[PDB]
Amino acid sequence: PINVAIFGSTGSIGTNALNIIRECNKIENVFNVKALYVNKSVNELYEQAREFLPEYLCIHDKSVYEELKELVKNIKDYKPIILCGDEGMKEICSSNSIDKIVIGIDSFQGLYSTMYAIMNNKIVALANKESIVSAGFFLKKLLNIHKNAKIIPVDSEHSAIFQCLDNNKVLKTKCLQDNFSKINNINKIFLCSSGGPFQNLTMDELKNVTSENALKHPKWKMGKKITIDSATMMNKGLEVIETHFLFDVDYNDIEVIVHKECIIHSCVEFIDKSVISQMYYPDMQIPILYSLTWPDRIKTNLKPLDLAQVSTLTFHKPSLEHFPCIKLAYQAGIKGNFYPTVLNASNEIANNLFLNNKIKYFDISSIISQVLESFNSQKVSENSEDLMKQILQIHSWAKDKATDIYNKHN
């Protein structure tokens, strides 16, 4: 019986997590949903509580706390512990009844909850790539202290890589640890990308693309921020750094490859040169489920992959001239220090400016480049609390710098 908490239970990751839990539990009772946590979606939380009957309920916005307490009286034979805010989140993380926590929260409230799950030696199913990019060294330090805590990757490509590894080796180590790649005999990673909507466009066409071109009738329905990052390939740039931190793979041994069918989710080359890959239809339920069943697998009723129907799988190298965000991500990763923090923060600003029609496509990369060029390496604090404060300071500095560059140009 797997006891699971879901943080951000009404977002995309949270609802896909509950969907696969529901469907798997029909086949065999495997999961007990112990806690649900949302920002302010009190009615959606009530609907989930009605079905899943968790021991804990938490809502971040305290203005809707009483509104939740009244609604929950409608559910029969049910007396949950209803909590509020950061203190509620912390009480859930500290509960002995919870084994695994799904983090479906974007940005730094995601990092904050991840931190407390780790301090409580839980398994943390983590989808938030920006938290790993911006606080990777901090998370490594925290995981070295809290020896039974584990991050299990949910980002589709990183789940794929993790699924391609031998658990007889994985169990000797854990993600976001030094020497992970040595212990697992990993030589190199093929990190698969959809390529986004702009692969066939010329440099002159890219000059004029808008956020509407990136968002309009998309091949893959996703959130706006990640859709823009897919269009610039900065999504893959961030995922290169995510790969480096999760699996301790050198940047020279991570290759971005454009695979437009999105059936192969990534591939691992081992030291003998044998390559293992993971494949499925594009569907977050498989990566989410594996994060909750690892090191085992369980039965689902998902549609089986029909390779004959798929028929063709294609691969090509991305053009760094057309997708300069990729090069910027490698440069930041290789420089190390807090350059990944700076990359992520400046991209947060540049992405949103492009989304709102304030800058052009190549201005995204120009702004990010200028902020990276302005940053000077800082001595990394040995003290965990000071290190988190450095990450926050540098994140804020980089956002401000990106905004200042935009303001001067405008």
Ligand X SMILES: CN(O)C(=O)C[C@@H](CCCc1cccc2ccccc12)CP(=O)(O)O
Name which of 55 and 130 has its Cβ closer to Mn ion. Answer: 130
Contact 36, 56 (CB under 8 A): yes
Q: Does 131 bind ligand X (CB under 6 A)?
A: no
Within 8 A by CB and 6+ apart from 36, the residues are 5, 6, 9, 45, 48, 49, 52, 54, 56, 57, 58
**Using rule CB under 5 A, residue 163 touches Mn ion:** no
Maximum separation of any 2 CA atoms in the chain, in Å? 64
Q: Which stretch binds ligand X (CB under 6 A): 53-61, 63-71, 281-289, 395-403?
A: 281-289
Strand-pair category, 2-7 with 31-38: parallel
User: Is the CB of 58 or the CB of 103 nearer to ligand X?
Assistant: 103
CB nearer a copy of itself, residue 157 or residue 269 = 269
Return the number of the residue (49 or 234) whose C-beta is nearest ligand X. 234
* Residue 264 beta carbon to a copy of itself: minimum distance, rounded to whole angstroms: 8
10 Å CB burial of residue 383 (0-12, 13-18, 19+) is exposed
* Chosen residue from 9, 114, 193, 266 binding ligand X by CB under 6 A: 193
Output the CA–CA distances (angstroms, integers) from residue 248 to 137, 176, 334, 399, in the order listed: 11, 7, 13, 28
Q: Exactly one of 81, 270, 282, 293 binds ligand X (CB under 6 A); which one?
A: 282
Note whether 319 binds a copy of itself by CB under 8 A. Answer: no
Strand order in the sheet with 100-103: 81-84, 56-59, 31-38, 2-7, 100-103, 123-126, 150-153
Among the listed ranges 32-40, 113-121, 244-252, 271-279, the one in contact with a copy of itself (CB under 8 A) is 271-279
Burial of residue 366 (CB within 10 Å: 0-12, 13-18, 19+) is middle
Burial class (CB in 10 A: 0-12, 13-18, 19+), 46: middle
Decide which of a copy of itself, ligand X, Mn ion, none touches 284; Cβ closer than 5 to 8 Å per partner kind.
ligand X
Choose among Mn ion, ligand X, a copy of itself, none what residue 328 binds, the Cβ cut-off being 5 to 8 Å by kind: none
Q: Residues annotated as binding site for NADP(+)? A: 10-13, 39-41, 130, 223
Query: With binding defined as CB under 8 A, does residue 168 bind a copy of itself?
Result: yes
Positions in the binding site for a copy of itself (CB under 8 A): 163-164, 166-169, 171, 185, 187-188, 190, 257, 267, 269-280, 286, 289-290, 293, 295-300, 302-305, 307-308, 310-317
